[PDB]
Amino acid sequence: GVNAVHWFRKGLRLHDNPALKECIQGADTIRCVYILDPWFVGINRWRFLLQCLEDLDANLRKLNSRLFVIRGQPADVFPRLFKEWNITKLSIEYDSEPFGKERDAAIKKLATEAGVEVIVRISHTLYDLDKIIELNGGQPPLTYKRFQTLVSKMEPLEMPADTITSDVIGKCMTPLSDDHDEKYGVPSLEELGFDTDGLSSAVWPGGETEALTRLERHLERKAWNFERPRMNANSLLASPTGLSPYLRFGCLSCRLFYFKLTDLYKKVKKNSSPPLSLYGQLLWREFFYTAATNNPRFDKMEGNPICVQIPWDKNPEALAKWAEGRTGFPWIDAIMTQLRQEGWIHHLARHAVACFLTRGDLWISWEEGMKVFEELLLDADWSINAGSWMWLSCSSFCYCPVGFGRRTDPNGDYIRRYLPVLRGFPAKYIYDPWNAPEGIQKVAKCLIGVNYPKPMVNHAEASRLNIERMKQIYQQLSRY
Numbered sequence: 001g002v003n004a005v006h007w008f009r010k011g012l013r014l015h016d017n018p019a020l021k022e023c024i025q026g027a028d029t030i031r032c033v034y035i036l037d038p039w040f041v042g043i044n045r046w047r048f049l050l051q052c053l054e055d056l057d058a059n060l061r062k063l064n065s066r067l068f069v070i071r072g073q074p075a076d077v078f079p080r081l082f083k084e085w086n087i088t089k090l091s092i093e094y095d096s097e098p099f100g101k102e103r104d105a106a107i108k109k110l111a112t113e114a115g116v117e118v119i120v121r122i123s124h125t126l127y128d129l130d131k132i133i134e135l136n137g138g139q140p141p142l143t144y145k146r147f148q149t150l151v152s153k154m155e156p157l158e159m160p161a162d163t164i165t166s167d168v169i170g171k172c173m174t175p176l177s178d179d180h181d182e183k184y185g186v187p188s189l190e191e192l193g194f195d196t197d198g199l200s201s202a203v204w205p206g207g208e209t210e211a212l213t214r215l216e217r218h219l220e221r222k223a224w225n226f227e228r229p230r231m232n233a234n235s236l237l238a239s240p241t242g243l244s245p246y247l248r249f250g251c252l253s254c255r256l257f258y259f260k261l262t263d264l265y266k267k268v269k270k271n272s273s274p275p276l277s278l279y280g281q282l283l284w285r286e287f288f289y290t291a292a293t294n295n296p297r298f299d300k301m302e303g304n305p306i307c308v309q310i311p312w313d314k315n316p317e318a319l320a321k322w323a324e325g326r327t328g329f330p331w332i333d334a335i336m337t338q339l340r341q342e343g344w345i346h347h348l349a350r351h352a353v354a355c356f357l358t359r360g361d362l363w364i365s366w367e368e369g370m371k372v373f374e375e376l377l378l379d380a381d382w383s384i385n386a387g388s389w390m391w392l393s394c395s396s397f398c399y400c401p402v403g404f405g406r407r408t409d410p411n412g413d414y415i416r417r418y419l420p421v422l423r424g425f426p427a428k429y430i431y432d433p434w435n436a437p438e439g440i441q442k443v444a445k446c447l448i449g450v451n452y453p454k455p456m457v458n459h460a461e462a463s464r465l466n467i468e469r470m471k472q473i474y475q476q477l478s479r480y
């Protein structure tokens, strides 16, 4: 009969999954596979992924199916699967990222050689990015405002695809052996080799089920403005309404999010012509995917045509201090600790630690900060992470590491939550503990230089030098 495989990579969901819906159409058997290579990334990313697969597996059970988790690399695994399962249809959600496109072109050639039809559908982005690039003339818009103009002229988005249900599955069945778990089951972090003794309950549980619950809560919060919210101290904490990791893994469809937001706006504001500001989260995301898709050096400075060639410092010791939250600036270190422990920090917290590392204090390449966020951050994939780091560092498209935190959370509770060694300090000194008298340091049981490091730069001197560097660079921008 007709034996189909849907290959999950992103799009880790059953709702709005047109590739999977089309693949099941006219198929006698369906197997959903995730190809896992744990030896080819921080532990919170692995955990989030595994939880996404457990959720997918549980939701597939409802359809008399299971997720097949296969170890290895797609180029080695799919030829054997095509033969051992007699596959003639393989579906994927389209991946616009350069190395994804290259991988998928290689797989499509194997599938062509084996007599397998490849179904590719766009549903990780709102638009066909290639059509945006055609509308701008063959080059991506390199400013957000130009991106918004292009997008506002595009044909309206079609409805998200129907969720896979039993009436959709129909006659299509999944052949299952009794030892499915032993051979195809979702592994634990331990079975990938990680110690989990230090881990607590995940602040960001993976999965489509979690995503659809959060989407509902997110919309209620927006219904009880549609303008960009203002950050306060509470905004720094992970929110039960946060959607960004779910959008990054495809647990939540960006198109379903778009339609629900539009429906809420129309119900609350009573106009069918909402401002594109309603969609800023999704359109910035779409902007960077568009910028990145045809630029295989998007995550690099040298050889990247859109990146200013800035002579960054090379300083592995300062880089590691920043990455490990040992800068001696409690605001910076608390943010980097939350990122390390939980996998998410507020975007203005991102601005602060990125400015500190790059154009503000340490003059280290944005490429280095990007790699750290890649390991630790749940919601930033290759295109978004690179684009955001170039944007922040003034490389394409000055935060005070004391006063920003002090203005955001003057009582210092954010610091005390993530930097316990500093809990004894009073508010007057919690953001600048080097300024506390030796008496206050001793009472706080935290000698600066012993129990918590001294600040790694003088901010005023470092920012003054770096602000002059960036002014001179842009005063001669064509040189760079």
Ligand SMILES: COc1ccc(/C=N/NC(=O)CSc2nc3ccccc3n2C)c(OC)c1OC
Binding pocket: 280, 281, 282, 284, 285, 288, 347, 348, 350, 351, 354, 373, 380, 384, 385, 388, 389, 392
């Ligand atoms: C240093 O790294 C980062 C720096 C900044 C941001 C985002 N800051 N967001 C704003 O300033 C308000 S608008 C907005 N919504 C977006 C959604 C996606 C991508 C960009 C976005 N922008 C600009 C970030 O998150 C992606 C980073 O992580 C990699």
